[PDB]
RNA sequence: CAAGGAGGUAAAAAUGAAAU
RNA sequence: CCGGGCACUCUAACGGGACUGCCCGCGAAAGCGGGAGGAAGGAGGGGACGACGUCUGGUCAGCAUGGCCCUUACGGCCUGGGCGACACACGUGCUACAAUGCCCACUACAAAGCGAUGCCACCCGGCAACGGGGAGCUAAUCGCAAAAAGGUGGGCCCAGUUCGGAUUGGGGUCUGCAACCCGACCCCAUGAAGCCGGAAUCGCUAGUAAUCGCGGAUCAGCCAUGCCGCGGUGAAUACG
């Protein structure tokens, strides 16, 4: 019933921090749908390489925003207990909602 | 010439970020401006420390700020000032958790920003630049470096004629990705103008 | 006209259409990205610095 | 007639819709 | 092309209407084409600014959607060598 | 009713090919292998690996397709049909190689590169 | 008589006395030269040693060039007692 | 058939033949024959005289067309004669009315190139 | 400087025929990369061949190409600011290419209305030895004929 | 199978640029 | 669409995968040619990467900065004008000159990206632009979008003609304090030049040229036919 979403710019921190919550939910009495890899939202932009006025030949950058989903079954305060405030991100945004 | 910033050229693999936080739109713009104003405010009254980095991390009103310094001499024991209101003056336009840490950069002769900054000081001391370059390189090479390279360009020793002094010992492969190459830069302000100091420090990888 | 001109860019009163974007790091009025609030010049500088969270070189 | 404002083809090219090119169904 | 607005300058009209009761003098300036021809005070002259000076334009019916400054060219041209 | 693998891809096109051992040479997806591919000459070339083998309608085709346009889909179907008959007939390998019906064909649309007008077409100049 | 300008800064210095288009230390210099080119009734008058006068070659044929200072030139076309296309440029 | 001021178009579809009149174009064309109730794909070759009469009576009336509306259009430009606006001066000088680019192009009103050279 | 001799491109055989030639012809018909319209026109014209003559288009088309084959062509070469025109032999690859190219071009040169009838007729004319392409072929061989003088320059 | 000594030699295509 | 399942497809995270390693031939070696080996090969196809240096190259109008000059002003604010001017010349382009074409209707097949101070389903008024409503969507959920060339049917029948769309008149919409100078669309009527380009000149060697539409940045709006991307169909030729 409990749905958690984890967005992030770094994939290595995401693929690891959203895997901790798979271990911290499985070893507390619940069935956990593993790291669901939602598609990425790549936000590119292309900037002229020079401060002057050399239109041809520039250089572009991208801001990949990754999405990862995990669902746990029963909202028992046994699994809730651990995932309550035992948070270890580096800024990774987490969404917790039940529906 | 034309060569890409050896830091940006890595970023992903080798050399991580310097401001590590995540946000969507309507927030990124505000938090980046604040973030940059922290870097701007710190650089001023903390230059005497000579800061190699200014790492920043966030987590909803958490704002962690790690200041790497060769010699953290300007911290002086708890209530001995140089930290108290100093790490608290940040929250005069922030008001968030101003968690300011201090790191001890062990060898300053292996920190590119510090190397270039030491050189740029010497330019303003009216030192002989070519000899200053040579020494700084060997100094870096003396402290165990796998390769080094310092570059001062323009208006050397005053004198109407922009020059470019060049020195580099050992190995500095800029094209390679598994490089671990530290890059630093510094503005030397002189009574006759402005000149830039590049500093490249290289260690192994694989 | 540059100092009094980066004043108006933040002042923003009097008719809603007279307000415009403006790089914060610089004072550039052109090629100002809404996402960063920066000109294309400054944005490139900081992206190479590493001071742009997540922002990375694009190769494909 | 990619530039004639009285065709489904010119309306495509211009982008906009209208009588010569209705917004589907 | 407005339809439910169809506007004239309030300040142009203030000066134009309070100088319209039982008659007036043609001494009346402006600084904005922005307005519109305005019926009533047709037998009037409106010195419109063209960027350099105030050109006395005259109203004699015939004009409507043409605000003002169309009766006040801003350029000169006049000729190209010939 | 039945199943036989199916993974044919060509230039952003995905086709899952099944075939069910029955004399009814049939179709899939929208309408007929015709109908859905009518007016298209090269559409019927996807059934050439069946001609390469001894299949004059021994299977009931079932290919769900997606992505790309018709031609790529048709190409992908060819790769899927072949991928089926090579799967449940491992000895039918000695015809998918000489005839070359088994290749994903990495030939895909090349990226728009800056400066150039489109892929490789240079923007054209005059010195004067 | 000077009759046409190509350089805006030059134009403003001679017409309105606007000096903000030229170098500040070359104001007097450029002025005395322009007045000389204005008073000149023939190219032979623009021949003082301090001007280093000469006609240009190639595509710039028909033009002349007196020296202001350093690598800086005032170029023009002199014809029938008048100079045209007064430009300020590098050598 | 001498419909308005013209008669020319013979064997060539009435919805098309109609077009050959200053005032008809394409929209008023099918609009006129659906309102008159006549088959558009007909021969134009003098078919049923009745259909031709009804068509003529409706078309030639209703809206202004041919030489009459050419006169009105020319008179609408003559409006900006007197002491007219800016748009009139553009009709005076022979230059484009809608304020476009005249540095190049604008040949459809200026006419073929004249070349000054200097 | 052509270090590689540029290997000969190979095609896909068509539908119903299996030609290693017809598809090459359909390609020349093809404009803007529409093989659908291209192939259709040829097969259309194939249906048109059946009408005016009781012959199978696979031979009518085949023989037409064979009749629009340049035995030898003229080649401009060396010494004198490239002044000479040595008449050279034509490679089977080039006869191939010229035949199909001249066919389609001459076909669209015809005053007919539909693309199919142009193709069909130009093929029938060429199969006989009458086509405008056959003119082109015979013309190119005239040029090669008149240059036998310094043909011994060869190469 | 390896070369020295001998001979016919390109064409029609001119200028130079604006302080060291 | 539900029950249920997640093997297929896809999604995105780490991996496996060829190194001419294996066979023939050539060679002193490097290596080259050829062959089953497989999705792939003798740098697989594209990116990011630009040596010492050169051009007194470019940029004091991104920014920084030595020097020179201006300070009731070379600074500051405002309304209006101008950057959009047009007898002309060059560059890069878009749309065409038609029948492998144009118009109308029906009916399919993408990728890559953007949106809750917005994208706006479905209705309602309206020929239409668009307006009234109003659901879902912090968005592999909802929306932008039906991709277009294609296919089927039908109509023009080769004439500047249902090719072509310039130019101009009239009527309207939407953003905006306001669109005359100088906004984009919509509708009616006009319908120009052009019937394929002189001397010259450009691009591209395989998904490539050509052709077709789609997205984004900036952005109240938009002068975008531009730029940066995405995929659809898909040639010709290389002797030398
Ligand atoms: Mg360009
Ligand atoms: Mg802006
Ligand atoms: Mg493409
Ligand atoms: Mg204009
Ligand atoms: Mg000479
Ligand atoms: Mg010389
Ligand atoms: Mg490399
Ligand atoms: Mg220079
Ligand atoms: Mg400056
Ligand atoms: Mg401009
Ligand atoms: Mg004509
Ligand atoms: Mg014609
Ligand atoms: Mg190549
Ligand atoms: Zn800036």
Residues 6+ apart with CB under 8 A from A41: A64, A65, A67
Q: Which domains does chain E have, with CATH numbers?
A: 6-82 (3.30.860.10)
The rounded Cα E6 to chain-centroid distance in angstroms is 15
Tell me how far CA of residue A41 lies from CA of A7, A44, A64, in angstroms.
10, 10, 6
C29 labelled ligand-binding: no
Looking up tokens 């200041």, which residue turns up?
B67
Q: Where are the domains of chain H?
A: 1-71, 72-118
Q: How far apart are CA B148 and CA B172, in angstroms?
A: 6
Q: How far apart are CA H113 and CA I6, in angstroms?
A: 50
Whether the Cβ atoms of residue G33 and residue G41 lie closer than 8 Å to each other: no
Neighbours of ion ligand 4 (CB under 5 A): H 99
Q: How far apart are CA I22 and CA I62, in angstroms?
A: 9
Residues 6+ apart with CB under 8 A from E54: E29, E47, E48
Q: How far apart are CA F108 and CA I98, in angstroms?
A: 31
Whether the Cβ atoms of residue C53 and residue B59 lie closer than 8 Å to each other: no
Whether the Cβ atoms of residue A35 and residue A19 lie closer than 8 Å to each other: yes
Q: A8-40: b or e for each residue (b if 16 or more CB lie within 10 Å)?
A: bbbeebbeebbeebeeebeebebebeebeeeee
DSSP states of G16-49 as a string?
A: T---TTS-STTHHHHHHHHHHHHH-SSGGGS--G
Q: In what order do the strands lie in the sheet with B99-104?
A: B19-20, B51-57, B64-69, B99-104
Q: How far apart are CA F101 and CA A63, in angstroms?
A: 40
Tokens of B120: 């740029």
Rg, Å, chain D Cα set: 8
Tokens of B57: 């991390």
Strand K positions closer than 7 A to protein CB: 8-14, 36-40, 44-54, 58-59, 62-69, 74-96, 99-106, 108-117, 127-130, 139-140, 145-152, 155-158, 161-170, 172-192, 201-211, 213-214, 217-220, 225, 227-240
Q: What is the architecture, at CATH level 2, of domain F2-128?
A: 2-Layer Sandwich (3.30)
Q: How far apart are CA I12 and CA I35, in angstroms?
A: 13
Q: Which residue is nearest to nucleotide K74 (CA to C1')?
A: G20
DSSP states of F81-112 as a string?
A: HHHHHTTS-TTTTTTTTTS---------PPPP
Give the DSSP H or E segment for I72. Answer: strand I72-76
β-bridge partners, B104: B69
C60 labelled ligand-binding: no
Chains with 3 or more CB pairs closer than 8 angstroms to C? Answer: A, B
State the burial class of residue H89 (Cβ atoms within 10 Å of its Cβ: 0-12, 13-18, 19+).
Answer: middle
The rounded Cα B153 to chain-centroid distance in angstroms is 18
Resolution in A: 3.4
Tokens of D8: 């489904």
Q: Which CATH number fits domain A1-98: 3.40.50.10320, 1.10.3720.10, 3.40.50.800, 3.30.70.600?
A: 3.30.70.600
Chain B residues touching C25 at Cβ < 8 A = 36
Nearest chain F Cα distance for residue I88, angstroms: 35
Give the DSSP H or E segment for F17. Answer: strand F14-17
Among the listed residues B199, B172, B174, the one whose alpha carbon sits nearest the alpha carbon of residue B187: B199
DSSP states of G53-86 as a string?
A: --B--GGGTT-EEEEEETTEEEEEEEETTEEEEE
Chain H residues touching E58 at Cβ < 8 A = 83
DSSP states of chain B as a string?
A: -----TTTTTSSSSS--SEE----TTTHHHHHHHHHHHHHHHHHTTGGG-EEEEEEE-SSS--EEEEEES-TTTT-TTTSSSSTTTTTSGGGS--S--EEEEEE-S-GGG-HHHHHHHHHHHHHTT--HHHHHHHHHHHHHHTT-SEEEEEEESSTTSSSS--EEEEEEE---SS-SS--EEEEEEEEEETTEEEEEEEEEE----
CATH number for the region I1-155 comes to 1.10.455.10
The rounded Cα B55 to chain-centroid distance in angstroms is 11
Whether the Cβ atoms of residue F24 and residue F60 lie closer than 8 Å to each other: yes
Q: Does domain B107-206 have CATH number 3.30.1140.32?
A: yes
Please write down the long-range contacts of H13-21, taking CB distance under 8 Å and 24 or more positions apart.
H13/H40, H13/H41, H13/H42, H13/H43, H13/H44, H14/H38, H14/H39, H14/H40, H14/H41, H14/H42, H14/H44, H14/H55, H15/H40, H15/H41, H17/H44, H18/H59, H21/H59, H21/H65, H21/H66
Task: Give me the phi and psi of C26, to 5 degrees please.
Answer: -95, -135
Any alpha helices (H) in chain I, and if so which ranges?
22-29, 35-52, 57-67, 92-109, 115-128, 132-146
Q: Where are the domains of chain F?
A: 2-128
3-state secondary structure of E47: strand
Tokens of I25: 């012809």
Tokens of F119: 């892929």
Q: Where are the domains of chain G?
A: 1-91
Q: Which CATH number fits domain B16-106: 3.40.50.720, 3.30.300.20, 3.30.300.130, 3.30.1490.20?
A: 3.30.300.20
State the burial class of residue A80 (Cβ atoms within 10 Å of its Cβ: 0-12, 13-18, 19+).
Answer: middle
Whether the Cβ atoms of residue A67 and residue A38 lie closer than 8 Å to each other: yes
DSSP states of H27-84 as a string?
A: HHHHHHHHHTT--TTS--SS--HHHHHHHHHHHHTTS--THHHHHHHHHHHGGGSTT-
Q: C4-40: b or e for each residue (b if 16 or more CB lie within 10 Å)?
A: eebeebeeeeeeeeeeebbbbbeebeeebbeebbbbb
Q: Where are the domains of chain I?
A: 1-155
State the burial class of residue I52 (Cβ atoms within 10 Å of its Cβ: 0-12, 13-18, 19+).
Answer: exposed
Q: Which CATH number fits domain H1-71: 1.10.8.50, 1.10.150.130, 2.160.20.10, 3.40.50.2300?
A: 1.10.8.50
- Residue H92: how many CA atoms within 13 Å on its side-chain side? 12
Q: G31-49: b or e for each residue (b if 16 or more CB lie within 10 Å)?
A: eebbeebeebeebeebeee
3-state secondary structure of G4: coil
Give the DSSP H or E segment for A34. Answer: strand A32-47
Please write down the long-range contacts of C20-29, taking CB distance under 8 Å and 24 or more positions apart.
C24/B33, C25/B36, C27/C2
Whether the Cβ atoms of residue F68 and residue F12 lie closer than 8 Å to each other: yes
Among the listed residues I1, I119, I2, I4, the one whose alpha carbon sits nearest the alpha carbon of residue I64: I119
Tell me how far CA of residue G1 lies from CA of F101, G41, G43, in angstroms.
86, 8, 12
Q: Does domain H72-118 have CATH number 4.10.910.10?
A: yes
Whether the Cβ atoms of residue B35 and residue B54 lie closer than 8 Å to each other: no
**Residues across chain A:** 99
Domain C1-60 class in CATH: few secondary structures
Tell me how far CA of residue I95 lies from CA of F54, I72, I107, in angstroms.
38, 9, 18
CATH superfamily of G1-91: RelE-like (3.30.2310.20)
Q: How far apart are CA B90 and CA B44, in angstroms?
A: 13
Residues 6+ apart with CB under 8 A from F27: F33, F34, F35, F36, F61
**CB pairs below 8 Å between B and C: how many?**
54
Q: How far apart are CA I22 and CA I11, in angstroms?
A: 10
**CB pairs below 8 Å between A and C: how many?**
34
Among the listed residues G43, G14, G15, the one whose alpha carbon sits nearest the alpha carbon of residue G31: G14
Strands B99-104 and B193-202: unpaired
**Residues across chain G:** 91
Q: How far apart are CA E51 and CA E74, in angstroms?
A: 6
Q: How far apart are CA B197 and CA B182, in angstroms?
A: 14
Q: Give E 37-66 residues with CB within 8 A of chain H.
A: 58, 60, 62-63, 66
Strands F8-9 and F14-17: antiparallel
Q: Is the CB of C48 less than 8 angstroms away from the CB of B33?
A: no
Q: Is the CB of B7 less than 8 angstroms away from the CB of C49?
A: yes
Nearest chain A Cα distance for residue B132, angstroms: 31
Q: How far apart are CA A45 and CA I77, in angstroms?
A: 53
């Amino acid at each position: 019933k409990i749905r958690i979403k984890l967005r992030g710019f770094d994939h290595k921190t995401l693929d690891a921090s959203a895997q901790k919550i798979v271990e911290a939910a499985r070893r507390s009495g619940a069935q956990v749908s593993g790291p669901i890899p939602l598609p990425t939202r790549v936000r590119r932009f292309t900037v002229i390489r020079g401060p002057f006025k050399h239109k041809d030949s520039r250089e572009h950058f991208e801001l990949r925003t990754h999405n990862r989903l995990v669902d746990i079954i029963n909202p028992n305060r046994k699994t809730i207990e651990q995932l309550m405030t035992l948070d270890l991100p580096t800024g990774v945004e987490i969404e917790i909602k039940t529906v | 010439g034309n060569k890409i910033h050896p830091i940006g050229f890595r970023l992903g693999i080798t050399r991580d970020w310097e401001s590590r936080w995540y946000a969507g739109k309507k927030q990124y713009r505000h938090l980046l401006l604040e973030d940059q104003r922290i870097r701007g405010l710190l650089e001023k009254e903390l230059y005497s420390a000579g800061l190699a980095r200014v790492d920043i991390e966030r987590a909803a009103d958490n704002v962690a700020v790690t200041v790497h310094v060769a010699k953290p001499g300007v911290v002086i024991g708890r209530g001995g000032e140089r930290i108290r209101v100093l790490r608290e003056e940040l929250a005069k336009l922030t008001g968030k958790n101003v968690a300011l840490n201090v790191q001890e950069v062990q060898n300053p002769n292996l920190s590119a920003p510090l190397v270039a900054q030491r050189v740029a000081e010497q330019i303003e001391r009216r030192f002989a630049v070519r000899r200053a370059i040579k020494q700084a390189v060997q100094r870096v090479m003396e402290s165990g470096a796998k390769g080094a390279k310092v570059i001062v360009s323009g208006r050397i020793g005053g004198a109407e004629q922009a020059r470019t002094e060049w020195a580099a010992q050992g190995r500095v492969p800029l094209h390679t990705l598994r490089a671990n190459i530290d890059y630093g830069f510094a503005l030397a302000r002189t009574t006759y103008g402005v000149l830039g100091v590049k500093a490249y420090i290289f260690l192994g990888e694989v | 006209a540059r100092k009094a001109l980066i004043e108006k860019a933040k002042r923003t009163p009097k008719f809603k259409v007279r307000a415009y974007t403006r790089c914060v790091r610089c004072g550039r009025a052109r090629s100002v990205y809404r996402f960063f609030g920066l000109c294309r010049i400054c944005l490139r500088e900081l992206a190479h610095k590493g001071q742009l969270p997540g922002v990375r070189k694009a190769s494909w | 007639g990619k530039g004639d404002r009285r065709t489904r083809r010119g309306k495509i090219w211009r982008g906009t819709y209208g009588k010569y090119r209705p917004r589907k169904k | 092309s407005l339809k439910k607005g169809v506007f004239v300058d309030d300040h142009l009209l203030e000066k134009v209407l309070e100088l319209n009761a039982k008659g007036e003098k043609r001494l009346i300036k402006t600084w904005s084409r922005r307005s519109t021809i305005v019926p009533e005070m047709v037998g009037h002259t409106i010195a419109v600014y063209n960027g350099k000076q105030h050109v006395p334009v005259y109203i004699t019916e015939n004009m409507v959607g043409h605000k003002l400054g169309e009766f006040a060219p801003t350029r000169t041209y006049r000729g190209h060598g010939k | 009713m039945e199943q036989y693998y199916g993974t044919g891809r060509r230039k952003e096109a995905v086709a899952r090919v099944f075939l069910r051992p029955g004399n009814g040479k049939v179709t899939v997806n929208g309408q007929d292998f015709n109908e859905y591919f009518q007016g298209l000459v090269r559409a019927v070339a996807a059934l050439e690996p069946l001609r390469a083998v001894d299949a004059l309608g021994h299977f009931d085709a079932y290919i769900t397709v997606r992505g790309g346009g018709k031609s790529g889909q048709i190409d992908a179907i060819k790769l899927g049909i072949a991928r089926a008959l090579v799967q449940y007939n491992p000895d039918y390998r000695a015809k998918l190689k000489p005839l070359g019906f088994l290749t994903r064909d990495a030939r895909v649309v090349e990226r728009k590169k800056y400066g150039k007008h489109k892929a490789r077409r240079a923007p054209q100049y005059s010195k004067r | 008589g000077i009759k046409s300008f190509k350089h805006k800064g030059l134009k403003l210095l001679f017409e309105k006395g606007v000096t903000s288009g030229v170098p500040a230390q070359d104001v007097d210099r450029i002025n005395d030269r322009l007045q000389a080119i204005d008073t000149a009734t023939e190219i032979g008058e623009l021949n003082r040693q301090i001007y280093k006068l000469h006609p240009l070659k190639g595509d710039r044929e028909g033009y002349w060039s007196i020296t202001v200072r350093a690598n800086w030139r005032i170029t023009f076309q002199f014809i029938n007692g008048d100079a045209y296309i007064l430009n300020y440029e590098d050598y | 058939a001498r419909i308005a001021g013209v008669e020319i178009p013979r064997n060539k579809r009435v919805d098309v033949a109609l077009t050959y009149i200053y005032g008809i174009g394409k929209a008023r064309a099918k609009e006129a024959l659906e309102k008159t109730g006549i088959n558009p794909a007909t021969r134009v070759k003098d078919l049923t005289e009745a259909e031709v009469v009804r068509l003529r009576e409706y078309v030639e009336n209703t809206w202004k067309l041919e030489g009459e509306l050419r006169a009105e259009v020319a008179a609408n430009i003559k409006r900006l004669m007197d002491i007219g606006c800016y748009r009139g001066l553009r009709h005076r000088r022979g230059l484009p009315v809608r304020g476009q680019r005249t540095r190049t192009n604008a040949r459809t009103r200026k006419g073929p190139r004249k070349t000054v050279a200097g | 400087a052509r270090r590689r001799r540029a290997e000969v491109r190979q095609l896909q055989p068509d539908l119903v025929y299996g030609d290693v030639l017809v598809t090459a012809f359909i390609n020349k018909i093809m404009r803007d990369g529409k093989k659908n319209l291209a192939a259709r026109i040829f097969y259309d014209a194939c249906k048109i061949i059946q009408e005016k003559t009781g012959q199978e288009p696979l031979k009518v088309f085949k023989q037409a190409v064979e009749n629009v084959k340049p035995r030898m062509e003229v080649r401009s070469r060396r010494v004198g600011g490239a002044n000479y025109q040595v008449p050279m032999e034509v490679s089977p690859r080039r006869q191939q290419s010229l035949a199909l190219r001249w066919l389609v071009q001459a076909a669209n040169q015809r005053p007919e209305r539909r693309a199919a009838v142009r193709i069909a007729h130009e093929l029938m004319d060429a199969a006989e030895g009458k086509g405008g392409a056959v003119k082109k072929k015979e013309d190119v061989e005239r040029m090669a004929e008149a240059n036998r003088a310094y043909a011994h320059y060869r190469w």
